[PDB]
């Protein structure tokens with residue numbers, strides 16, 4: 271088997287209701303792990319949304335609308351993206367967020383693509399962290415502080431690499 | 443063919459990051475978010491500052507195709 275530690279950046283999210291509705295993925299970052307080792311077979315893409323980035327979202331990832339204009343759309347990278355993760359165990363911090371966004375984008379392609387959970391094992395590192403450290407703060411930053419990992423703007427690929435180190439530490 | 447950025451040249455990937463910073467400055471100027479452009483250029487690898495300045499000019503032009511911070515879109 272193989273594990274893909276993944277993260278995404280978006281145009282934002284809804285405080286109420288379906289968190290992804292009307293928003294878009296603008297960055298996908300993922301790093302492969304096999305036998306607890308970073309293989310180097312990574313995936314990274316920026317995507318052109320059909321809308322503006324919420325200022326708040328920009329506050330988190332620093333990905334500008336100007337930067338996304340010449341980038342491919344989700345439809346254009348869809349298959350290359352699926353080929354890459356298919357069959358692997360996806361490790362995502364608060365998996366519900368990204369999986370919801372991923373399935374949302376796939377559904378927009380109108381290709382009857384099945385739910386990500388049907389062709390990938392989905393592991394929620396936030397759930398793993400909560401079982402491991404109940405009653406504690408388990409955000410990615412808190413976990414980094416816990417494991418004394420130094421990381422002196424967020425990014426999908428960056429957040430994936432960081433989550434990979436954190437997850438390895440958590441499961442070591 | 444392949445869009446995967448991770449599969450590209452280190453130089454190419456380095457360029458993408460400078461682009462991210464450059465476009466970021468233009469973005470802030472458009473949304474009226476304080477930013478000191480000169481400080482950011484400094485933060486970039488010396489052998490790429492020339493690239494940063496050109497990309498900054500480039501992205502500032504693209505900014506004109508987008509709404510200003512004072513426009514309805516951001517109301």
Ligand SMILES: Cc1cn([C@H]2C[C@H](O)[C@@H](COP(=O)(O)O)O2)c(=O)[nH]c1=O
Pocket residue numbers: 277278279280281282283326327330331367424429
């Ligand atoms: C932390 C945070 C994330 N987001 C959205 C935009 C981010 O690109 C996306 C993923 O965040 P994350 O990688 O920290 O989980 O969630 C917000 O809209 N507001 C926030 O305060």
Ligand SMILES: [Mn+2]
Pocket residue numbers: 277278363429
């Ligand atoms: Mn995330």
Ligand SMILES: [Mn+2]
Pocket residue numbers: 277278279424425426429
């Ligand atoms: Mn992130």
